[PDB]
């Protein structure tokens, strides 16, 4: 069964994603097929906030090799959700 | 479906062949995929280890090397003799290993 926790996979751990916390922008790895409207609801029901803005971008998996074997890491999708003025997501505040 | 092992951890076995033939010891481990057993203080080798957190001072350690499982014979806990194994069906009606020389359970 589909739940908000199927949509939000993991937080994005990078200096760029952390820089967003200050103004209330939290960045997640989300399911590649997930819609902006969908992610807004998932973040809201999971973390008890109000989402005012959602930005998405697909992240292509990097091609990689172990010796003779050429391969690809999986494709990902990340979302930047803007929470309502004054609100916070403490899980990510983290750090 | 499964590798047939006539011996298990950790019954007592005779090592019937090889440099350590005649030796007796408990079966520390069984490795079906190599069809091999580890027997306590049998088939000792000198292994080089690097200076590491695991081995400060480094040097060498001693290790038991696997033995082809056919080289090994279980010792009957009853009559104390090396033996082939037989299967016996109980009333249970489970099946057990029993000694061939006498009839005792080997478990």
């Amino acid at each position: 069964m589909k739940t908000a926790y199927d949509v939000i996979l993991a937080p994005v751990l990078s200096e760029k994603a952390y820089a967003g916390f200050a103004e209330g922008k939290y960045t997640f790895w989300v399911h590649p097929k997930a819609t902006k409207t969908e992610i807004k609801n998932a973040v809201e029901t999971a973390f008890k906030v109000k989402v005012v803005k959602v930005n998405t971008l697909h992240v292509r998996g990097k091609k990689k090799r172990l010796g003779r074997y050429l391969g690809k890491r999986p494709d990902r999708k990340k979302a930047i959700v803007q929470v309502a003025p004054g609100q916070k997501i403490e899980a990510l505040e983290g750090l | 479906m499964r590798v047939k092992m006539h011996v298990k951890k950790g019954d007592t076995v005779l090592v019937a062949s090889g440099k350590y033939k005649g030796r007796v010891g408990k079966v520390k481990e069984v490795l079906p995929k190599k069809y091999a057993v580890i027997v306590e203080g049998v088939n000792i080798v000198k292994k080089a280890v690097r200076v590491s957190p695991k081995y400060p001072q480094g040097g060498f350690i001693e290790k038991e090397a696997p033995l082809h499982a056919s080289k090994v014979r279980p010792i009957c806990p009853a009559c104390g003799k090396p033996t082939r194994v037989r299967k016996k069906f109980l009333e249970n009606g489970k099946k057990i290993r029993v000694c061939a020389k006498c009839g005792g359970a080997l478990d």
Binding site: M1, T3, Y5, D6, I8, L9, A10, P11, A46 | -
Partner: protein
């Protein structure tokens, strides 16, 4: 998970209503995410718990499908 704990999980699950199974799955999927988050920041040494929860969720949904199937 221990076999005994799996047995018990299925016994209790099969007594739950479809509605209770849904609520429970929802909560376990929430806990899974929490586990993911921890594993992501290297703070989950007991990593076996992730597989475990996943199979619990599967068992739960399997029973949910059992209940609804007739």
């Amino acid at each position: 998970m221990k076999l005994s704990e799996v047995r018990k999980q299925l016994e209790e699950a099969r007594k739950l209503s479809p509605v209770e199974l849904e609520k429970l799955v929802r909560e376990k999927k929430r806990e899974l995410m929490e586990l993911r988050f921890q594993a992501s920041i290297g703070q989950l040494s007991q990593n076996h718990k992730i597989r475990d929860l996943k199979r619990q969720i599967a068992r739960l949904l399997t029973v949910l499908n059992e209940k609804r199937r007739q």
